[PDB]
Amino acid sequence: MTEYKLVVVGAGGVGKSALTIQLIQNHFVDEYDPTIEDSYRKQVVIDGETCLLDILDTAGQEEYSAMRDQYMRTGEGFLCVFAINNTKSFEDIHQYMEQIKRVKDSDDVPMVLVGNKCDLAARTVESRQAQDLARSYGIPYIETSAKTRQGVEDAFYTLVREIRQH
């Protein structure tokens, strides 16, 4: 069966681990334990196809930025997460996407831009601002809540479907 190497990237605290754990383990992690680098694998059916999702949950803390080159080298698709209540994380995710492009020396890296924490009402990134950023990359924008599960499957499965357009 096809294996898909997904990598979840973004600034600290935007909910990378919460999104991944919700997808793989179907529960919401309320506490905040900063990640170094964790890996998850799960067999799922997507569009009638049995596949293996290999998911790398990466560090948002800048203290571990040295590890980025290795995982950007090997990742096949990138879930580029920011939190809609964190304008700085939106500015940061643009930097992540440029770094991925640079490390991979490619203009066509499979990516999905994800605006997480859409259950919160303290929004400072409007959907249209994120839509514009995605459009300049030619990639989808999807809003999610790891807390309510809204959009979580859509976001990860869209990224699978992006890898398959390539």
Ligand SMILES: Nc1nc2c(ncn2[C@@H]2O[C@H](COP(=O)(O)OP(=O)(O)NP(=O)(O)O)[C@@H](O)[C@H]2O)c(=O)[nH]1
């Ligand atoms: N309300 C709400 N809180 C969320 C959501 N996603 C994550 N959180 C909360 O935000 C905090 C950080 O989540 P976490 O997944 O650890 O973020 P992270 O991006 O993995 N952090 P790091 O980069 O340091 O590993 C946690 O308290 C978590 O419960 C969401 O969609 N909604």
Ligand SMILES: [Ca+2]
């Ligand atoms: Ca803890």
Ligand SMILES: [Mg+2]
């Ligand atoms: Mg984490």
Ligand SMILES: [Mg+2]
């Ligand atoms: Mg504004």
